[PDB]
């Protein structure tokens, strides 16, 4: 099997920390968003951003279950780990853009 088990073990740990950092970063945008909702009202723009945040929070919770099941697998599928890394990478980019967009409002 070579370095396949070691690569899966290292990628599992990297994705676990990546996901936990995304959960904290996305939850912190709730407080800034609610502050903007209080200051400006629940505008159509702020309402749409709240749905994005809620949807991102919902997906991170589901991907966390997927990561939990892969961590319990004695031989996790490297293809599932690679696909999970790609999803988290895209969620990182959406969260970074939402953070800059909330700071600009």
Numbering used by the authors: -9 to 95
What does the literature reporting this entry say, word for word?
Here we describe the combination of rational and computational design to deliver three-helix bundle (3HB) peptide assemblies and single-chain proteins with control over topology and thermal stability. First, we garner sequence-to-structure relationships from antiparallel 3HBs in the Protein Data Bank. This gives core-packing rules, including layers of hydrogen-bonded polar residues, which are combined with surface-charge patterning to design complementary sequences for acidic (A), basic (B), and neutral (N) helices. Synthetic genes for these express in E. coli to yield soluble, monomeric, and thermally stable proteins.
Next, ProteinMPNN was used to optimise the loop regions of the single-chain models while keeping the helical seeds completely intact. Based on pLDDT and RMSD, two BĀN and one BĀN′ single-chain designs were chosen to test experimentally. CD spectroscopy of all proteins showed that they were highly α helical and hyper-thermally stable, and AUC experiments confirmed they were monomeric in solution. We solved X-ray crystal structures at 2.10 Å, 2.15 Å and 2.20 Å resolution for the two BĀN- and one BĀN′-based designs, respectively. This was done by molecular replacement using the AF2 models of the peptide assemblies as the search models. All confirmed the three-helix bundles with up-down-up topologies for the B-Ā-N/N′ helices. In addition, water-mediated hydrogen-bonded layer of Thr (A) – Asn (B) – Thr (N/N′) was present in a clockwise design.
